[PDB]
Design a protein around this ligand. Structure first.
Ligand code: 4CP
Lengths: 250, 11, 27
């Protein structure tokens, strides 16, 4: 996260760290949506252009974390993956359209003050909150820019951007399954996700019921916190039918 | 070795 | 169910340092 700040303890209890077994390192962010299901970006697990194609046994999920590198004894919980489900129409060949994946844990994780699931939006909540100007929150242990790594989980609030502006900021083909967020050059304020934040959640707190909803998944960007550029996020509600289908079937 | 080792029970 | 309600915040009626920024943007 670029231009963000240290998260407070228990501020994002649904935050999940996708951890590579060997070599041990941060692979991506993810989110907890139930005691046995974790949501992330498909490109975190599958991206042929970069020879990336992880299998269940290649990674681990670390939940309840705050510190990036330390083993948080008595706080974080580490889970093994039972199965990975990538959207069948995920477009890794071109623009990362439908960049979404689910991971089922081998055993249910116990909720605590530091581990708790985020809500997935309904049609109404999505329609009401997914508006240009409305701000969401992005969290992660990714790069602080094109420098080093953070000691603890970082957080940044960013405004959703008008679709025409998103489209005119890049040469990549944007689809309805994506939305972009970030400040404009004239707004002064800054902030963006960066390497390592991919797969993490873009959440919004509903002013109707005071619950946090995951509206997006950190998907892609060109550079980090560059003026005139914006981060792109997977539109979770638009792909909810697939999410429900997978969970109902498996 | 950037990350602290985790219990063997999770290699 | 109980999703989206944080044990250390919503559950005990405590607000985090910047959630108000989000609320103020929902005009
Ligand atoms: N590590 C390097 N030396 N180079 C390098 C690393 C990754 C990429 C892929 C590219 N991502 C980025 O440029 C920055 S990461 C990023 C990911 C998602 C969002 Cl919403 C915002 C920023 C993308 N397509 O998302 C390109 C170059």
């Amino acid at each position: 996260i670029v231009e963000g700040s240290d998260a407070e303890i228990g501020m994002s209890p649904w935050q999940v760290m996708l951890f590579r077994k060997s070599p041990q390192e941060l692979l991506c962010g993810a989110s907890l949506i139930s005691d046995r299901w974790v949501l992330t970006a498909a490109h975190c697990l599958l991206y042929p252009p970069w020879d990336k194609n992880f299998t269940e046994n290649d990674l681990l999920v670390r939940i309840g974390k705050h510190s990036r590198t330390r083993y948080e004894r008595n706080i974080e919980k580490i889970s093994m993956l039972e199965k990975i489900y990538i959207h069948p129409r995920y477009n890794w060949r071109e623009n990362l359209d439908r960049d979404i994946a689910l991971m089922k844990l081998k055993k249910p994780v116990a909720f605590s003050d530091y581990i708790h699931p985020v809500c997935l939006p309904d049609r109404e909540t999505a329609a009401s909150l997914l508006q240009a100007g409305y701000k969401g929150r992005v969290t992660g242990w990714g790069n602080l820019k094109e420098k080093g790594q953070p000691s603890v989980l970082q957080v940044v609030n960013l405004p959703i951007v008008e679709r025409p502006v998103c489209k005119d900021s890049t040469r990549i083909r944007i689809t309805d399954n994506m939305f972009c967020a970030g400040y404009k050059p004239d707004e002064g304020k800054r902030g963006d996700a960066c390497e390592g934040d991919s797969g993490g959640p873009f959440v919004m707190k509903s002013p109707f019921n005071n619950r946090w909803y995951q509206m997006g998944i950190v998907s892609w960007g060109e550079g980090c916190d560059r003026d005139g550029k914006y981060g792109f996020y997977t539109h979770v509600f638009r792909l909810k039918k697939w999410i429900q289908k997978v969970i109902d079937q498996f | 070795g950037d990350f602290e080792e985790i219990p063997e029970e999770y290699a | 169910a109980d999703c989206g309600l944080r044990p250390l915040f919503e559950k005990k009626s405590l607000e985090d340092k910047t959630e108000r920024e989000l609320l103020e943007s929902y005009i």
